Design a protein around this ligand. Structure first.
Ligand code: FMN
Ligand code: FMN
Ligand code: FMN
Ligand code: FMN
Lengths: 351, 351, 351, 351
């Protein structure tokens, strides 16, 4: 009997082949930030208010115009068909059924349209401004046609972080899986090898402004841990900021997103929504993020680990667990809406 | 040979069935606060005064008018007949013999009158303002008739905390045990299932004020970790405040009651007594609580664990150990009365 | 090959019977302060000065008028003949040979005169102001006749701390050992049982002043962790203060003597010398104590553990190791005398 | 597959004889500072700037006039032929090929000229001002003739630190190895025993000034952890300061060089370059050192451990790994030159 979200990592570690579990579970180098992404939540306590009528909890929120059932969303991860045959189809169905947003990786094993064919649902598309700006365009288009509503642009990955497990595992994408967003596209004449060499080391904020010249979809600038870049993201025309450290997969010894969050929220000055991912496993984590000023969180690994465990039902139970846990956190904190989740409902180390 | 209170948990873990030990030992979720309830005592040091005549130690105190032999009382816990055949009878006899107060859970396996039939003793009755306000009335009445002197109203449990062991253990109350306070009552036509669905998610402070319209017994508002609600408890007409985090069984990542205590004591402004429970195992813990300004502490789990171990004699030895340990702490601190236990006799992390 | 002092504890644990090792090694309750006595040294760093001629290191000091070869002395411990047949004879010979002071416990297995018969040496006598003030007198006399030069009066032990190992081990003094300072004395008509019941719970500072009416020997008030009592010790007529926590054997959760030291040194205002014991195993510990303002340290357990290990040679090597280690600490810190050991040569957590 | 620098320690521990691994791996006493040299890097986080064109990273720097490919250099270590037959030859070839500086120990198993015969390369010579000032002269000369460009004078070793493993291992230099810098020199009529007795306990800053009377080569004063001595090093005529704690091999409980670094950099006031060694294993460590104001770092043990592992190729891969890791740290921090590595790119505990 699985009772918390973290237990799916343990199950996925048993069930998956080492190189796949590692590929997902990996953080950069000595995985300090990966641990810190979890540990830092445990250095924030609650300051609950009691004896408040919490019989009607509303955790529903609006994200870039779209109403969703909870401030708990799915972050993009690569190649989900290594975890489970359905892969991103199951994620889409689960995310649609949960009434929340799913971000799809450009490195997904299922295309935007494949995911869209599972049924209606609000979905964002994770991108890099790759070197081949025509390929970036095609992807964007492909996403717009598939009914995707925003672009989570990765901005902390001019180069890939050193996840040493992969080198030690000789990590190769399995035989019958492809990066389906790049299939059928004009690449200018191995696809994983292609996209890896396509990650652009030269990106500036002008390239974020450029991304806005090829799509009218709101741009979530994804991977901002500093108030300095939080400011620049607003000025660059970002629809929102995801305080992400790429699941601690890029630069290690970068702060946890929870430490980083409040600096970014304040720097954004309410001009745009500030989301978080990295180390959210508990409903208490969701709350803490929101009390620090986040507009909602994404989960990455729990989706792939639970997908690996129980398929769609695994992702269903992760969203449901986080939901129930978060509703209970709200109840036991005295919060009947997300607006009622205030800074005074928590205390951090760094107060 | 058992020499400290904590050793009864180890013995109870060996002796009990997993689901019963867990049921009692459980904290909410990743049991962070459960650990913190103990660990936080170890981040408070003593500042003992020496060469004071400590041959006559008086630890006797008065709690809501009633003289007791020590500021160490028994907190309410559910269904003690899972731990040991005698259950709450043994707790009552032990608490009477120790000359201290016992709080009985509404979820006890023995009724208020059953407990009262063991002999004379000062006893409080733990309650929820359940949805069926008529049932709450009957319980209150039943307690008053049984010679119970106060109501510890639980106020941090509009919904039950997620103690995952129970879900993983498929926790069912054993065959011949019942919640005896609810037996013989008009329930308006499984009792554990009933009372679980009776925990009221809608309670406000008006319902605390309502509890005072059906009993003249002093109301200990139980589960206040904030100065904000400490203030509201005074204004609501509480006879006292128990700084409790429900043995870390409700919201996890709530502060330890020892961190929380001093904020609550100060907020109460001496208008009412402020008690503590959660993580008291040592006489040094009792002292530390008292030096932070508590009027006395309750112990929960040590009672059920020692009951599980050695029956009544186990609870006898827990009270006696805590007593002797606390008398010695007082001696070695230079404190010959509870009034002589001052803030300057300790130092915390947070000074 | 034994290379540090701590290694003698490991050897003594192997070699001794459990109840004897425990008796010595025991701290009070959950042995928090016992650990802290060591750990706290590791939260003080050095601020060494380099390129200073350290070819001539003088660690010689004067303690209550007596010149000694180093600020590293032997603290009193009970019944050393449980550790090794020679017991306190070996300690005396070792302490004489090292040119340092040895404090003898009133609970020693060898009398003051027995110890004195090993040869010349500077020695202090540890006392309690026991209930039978005539017995205290006789002991004092006995010490003066044996050529003992000061009284280390224990002042943190109105009652014995709860060292649980002893209760769990059913700790009895071996058959042919006695408390030899009490042998041949008028006890007013088991000796361990006697002296245990003689520890006086009523002592005030007036009884310290009383001790000064029966001896002209300087009184080291032993067991002061507070500036408040450091002040009172000066006013009471103490020749010095030993910042001791009874090897963490009395009140647990009392601060380490190293945290406590600087508060006591400052409170004493240079009027009297302030010594330390508790958790000194390294020459770096000796330095740190001295830089915090101590006039010298005592070691307790290392003496009995090394005695248990290698007899007199064990205590010889402990003193020699601490010495060499301390000379090297002095060299590598830039300190050629104890006067040159300054506060700026260290940094603590609490600066 | 080796993926980080630390993994070479594990391999060297397997491969080497205990006394050799220990000899190298040893820190002083309880190896607190040795751990701290690593651990302290993990208490400094990054504050990366994103979306900066990092396609052209320049980590090239100038050290005492000499252009080198990176701010990552080789610290001197003794007797490298115990690790691997080639020993310091392999280090020289690797350091030449990496386009960085190698410091050679006076206690090397290969002479300055032997090392110089591997091919061209920028190299410093580590010295003690030994008691026999004529021997120091000869060494200096020997280094100048071998094309060595600076003297790293050790200044934290008036006496050797107590590395207990060596005493426990009965550490002897193997049969056919010698301290080749002392071979062929006029010693005034065992060489390891000789040089050990030659370490001068009397050195002052006047002896640093004296070293400058026998060579015009720039003097790196090596082993300064204090602003006080950082100041004195400038005044003494040092070409630079290496904030080193002798790989935590001298005084234990000395601060990590990373804690110490910023105090020394500020005290030097930009008058001379301030380098660091001790606990650099990651490119992130290199960055952190540089952001604290270091002009470049040296690595000691990784060279001998990787030499022990894979010979020259091992040292090649350590330099290459640190390089690649450091280039990536620079990329992911937004730093395209070492000048662009600023204090604001990190945050420590002690800010
Ligand atoms: C296998 C894998 C691949 C990922 N790929 C990307 C990526 O290409 N771009 C990106 O911005 N983030 C990427 N992420 C980061 C996630 O989008 C998300 O920030 C992270 O998983 C959240 O942390 P969590 O795993 O603790 O929930 C990836 C994460 C994983 C586990
Ligand atoms: C099995 C069990 C059931 C409990 N049930 C309740 C309850 O219904 N209401 C309540 O306010 N507290 C409840 N508590 C909390 C205790 O009253 C008390 O606050 C706690 O046990 C004190 O912490 P300790 O166990 O560390 O002594 C329960 C505790 C246990 C162990
Ligand atoms: C077996 C034993 C008995 C002791 N008895 C006494 C005592 O009767 N009075 C006293 O003041 N201190 C007593 N002490 C404390 C020591 O004098 C000394 O303060 C302590 O051993 C120093 O700490 P260390 O063991 O870490 O060196 C005793 C210590 C031990 C280990
Ligand atoms: C075996 C060995 C011998 C060393 N000998 C010396 C020495 O004679 N003089 C000196 O200044 N530093 C000496 N060091 C310190 C190194 O030069 C350097 O400061 C240290 O290795 C850097 O730390 P790291 O090992 O973590 O890289 C020695 C280090 C080792 C491992």
């Amino acid at each position: 009997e699985v009772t918390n979200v973290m237990e799916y990592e343990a199950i996925a570690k048993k069930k998956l082949p080492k190189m796949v579990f590692d590929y997902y579970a990996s953080g950069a180098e000595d995985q300090w930030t990966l641990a810190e992404n979890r540990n830092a939540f445990s250095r924030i306590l609650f300051r609950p208010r009691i004896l408040i009528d919490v019989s009607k909890i509303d955790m529903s929120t609006t994200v870039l115009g779209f109403k969703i059932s909870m401030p708990i969303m799915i972050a993009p991860t690569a190649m989900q068909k290594m975890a489970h045959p359905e892969g991103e189809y199951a994620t889409a169905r689960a995310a649609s059924a949960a009434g929340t947003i799913m971000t799809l990786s450009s490195w997904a094993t299922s295309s935007v349209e494949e995911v869209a064919s599972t049924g209606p649902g609000i979905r964002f598309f994770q991108l890099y401004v790759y070197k081949d700006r025509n390929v970036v365009a095609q992807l964007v288009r492909r996403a717009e046609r598939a009914g995707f509503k925003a672009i989570a642009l990765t901005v902390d990955t001019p180069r890939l972080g050193r996840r040493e497990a992969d080198i030690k595992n000789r990590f190769v994408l399995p035989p019958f899986l492809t990066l389906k967003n790049f299939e059928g596209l004009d690449l200018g004449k191995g696809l994983a090898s292609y996209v890896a060499g396509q990650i652009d080391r030269t990106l500036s904020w002008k390239d974020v402004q450029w991304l806005q010249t090829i799509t009218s979809l709101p741009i979530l600038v994804k991977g901002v841990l500093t108030a300095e870049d939080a400011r620049l993201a607003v000025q660059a025309g970002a629809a929102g900021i995801i305080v992400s450290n790429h699941g601690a997969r890029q630069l290690d010894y970068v702060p946890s997103t929870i430490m980083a969050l409040e600096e970014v929220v304040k720097a954004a000055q309410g001009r745009i929504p500030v989301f978080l991912d990295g180390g959210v496993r508990r409903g208490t984590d969701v709350f803490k993020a929101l009390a620090l000023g986040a507009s909602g969180i994404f989960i990455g690994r729990p989706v792939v680990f639970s997908l690996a465990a129980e398929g769609e039902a695994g992702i269903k139970k992760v969203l449901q667990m986080l939901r129930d846990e978060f509703e209970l956190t709200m109840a036991l904190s005295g919060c009947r809406s997300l607006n009622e989740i205030t800074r005074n409902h928590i205390v951090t180390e760094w107060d």
